[PDB]
Amino acid sequence: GLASILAIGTANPSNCFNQDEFPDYSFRVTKSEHLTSLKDKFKRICERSTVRKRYLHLTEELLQEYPSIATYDAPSLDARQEIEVAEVPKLAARAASRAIEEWGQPKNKITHLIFSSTSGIEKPGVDCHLVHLLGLPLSVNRVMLYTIGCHAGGTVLRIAKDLAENNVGSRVLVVCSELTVMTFRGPSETDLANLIRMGIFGDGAAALIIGADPDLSIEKPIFEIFSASQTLVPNTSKAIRGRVKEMGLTFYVDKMVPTLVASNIEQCLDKAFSPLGINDWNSIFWIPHPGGPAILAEIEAKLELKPGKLRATRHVLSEYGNMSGATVLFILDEMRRRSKKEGKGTTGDGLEWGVLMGFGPGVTVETIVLRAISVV
Template structure:
């Protein structure tokens, strides 16, 4: 990897200023000052200073936390077996839904498939599933039970397939995973799919699990934010963050003239799973850190809660995509959100083109908004555009597919996307309308 010096200033964080350096000794002041405690018998209105915590407790607190920032150690992705080329999708869709007679809707679907710039997509829905559960096709019939059953049967295996690739890339035993974070917007059950994923992978019974539900297109970035916190606050932790979605099983239905968003939604969404292993203080002997996760932030644009929504009902999930409004919303707000995320690190002074980009693509129109407002050079979002072309929008996992491609390109030629850029941004946009932003720094 290039040793070219970055024109951007280093962050004030001493640990972050040494990319992926070996851990030092003792605690790190970046975790905040010592906590205070109330002695037995104290009342809230007592005057005077509270006694400090016992030295042993403060020492334990420091020892439990990592010295350096979390790092991306490995990435893996997976898709269902059912792959349909985009130029065949409309014919397939109208045939399996027995709707060939709706020629005007079929024409609209074909037009949408051509416009979204997708080459192929992968689906959990198959003709066998539709034959076994014809109620899925009729939005007037209750089909939620069949859909949830299909998700419960398929989602853990898909998530585990992506995680197994990440673990293989990592090179350490699955039993070394200490934390598991699983994010999905496809179905819900108790216990969650995290239990089944842990079993399929052979994780220890003591692995600490966290489930995140219904974050849609921010699901992948949100899982990484939680993984970063777990890695930095638990010395030696190795966190497996997994995001898996099979939207086709939850939202597939026959064409409905009462749902005008149907052609656009069916033309762009696909299914997939992505997994990332995150850990602080990487071991020089057997780990290959790629990026530091220097900071993470989330911002919700006020008054936008109803622009992109999803609702569970008897017939599955219905989505309101607010298709025309979203690119405009991105154009009006994205620069301010990103500027606030990088301001504490002093990165904005270098300009947006001094960064590399790991962006959830959403659609080509959304990426056009990024490029126009941020005045990005051609090629800055090439990986995001490629992922959208090859897989469609898989909602939550999509940003992990982009991260996987960026990591592979950097490992292959030492630079890849963002050649010469030490700093970068991972960005996910989703319902709320919410932006998840993680500042990355390339490991040397």
């Protein structure tokens, strides 16, 4: 049958930053408190973000130990790499442990590992580090995806489906582990995209167990991955940009990205749901990647979605910020948990069919058709 999500675990850095206090904090540790005009622009960015809290690995203590990271352009990649090759696997392990505990099965039955990370590019990779941290079998088939990034939630589900469905008895540990250590830099009037980034983006790791043909005596499917499509939006390379440089990972998101996504989402939805004869975008549950509040606003407006469709998505954006590829997996967890707490008939807010969408560099749209499972 279809590749099924059997368990979902999440983890965040232990340090929590309230958005109210973040402009004061960020401008102090980057020695920028004298840039009162720029700090005012960032408070406004933070007020419109709809982000209330984020978890960040970067503390004032780490910036004091690695002062190059607190600047904008100073050579800092070695420092960032030293932090992330250690921390990306550790956070991944915390999320994978929660996923494996919910799953309830022994780690000997994990046959595949898909690991997506922006950070910690190294040989051997954070996928190997995770195998040794979790004590996974040495024979686990690994797919290490470095630097995708924001659509990676859809990417790992697309790859997990084919691995799970082509290997009888296979159980796929999927992990997205995202720290902002690699992209964090001091504020500048010469980089608006990075002001937005330092307002919206938070750290997090989400892990899940995928298998086809679960043993229903011991395993509980939460969602089925019905189909997975990727597409490029034509002539939109350069709309979402990042390069690994001596200053770490650079970051650019164009102000037109909300419009570009909303302008293309209908084609993706039509290709995904026409085979099912589904047409009404209010009749399916929604897991859109919350790049920011503007992208969610434009999707709602364009598809004329009812006021509550994106409740789960907005909750995760508000409570954790944008955790890149991990975010949609956090939203899957939020949706199934809210569904149980509100006594809905399915894991997908009482609805049978759902869409999960990643938006990232390309510009790339990852469209996953999910089937919810009946709760009783």
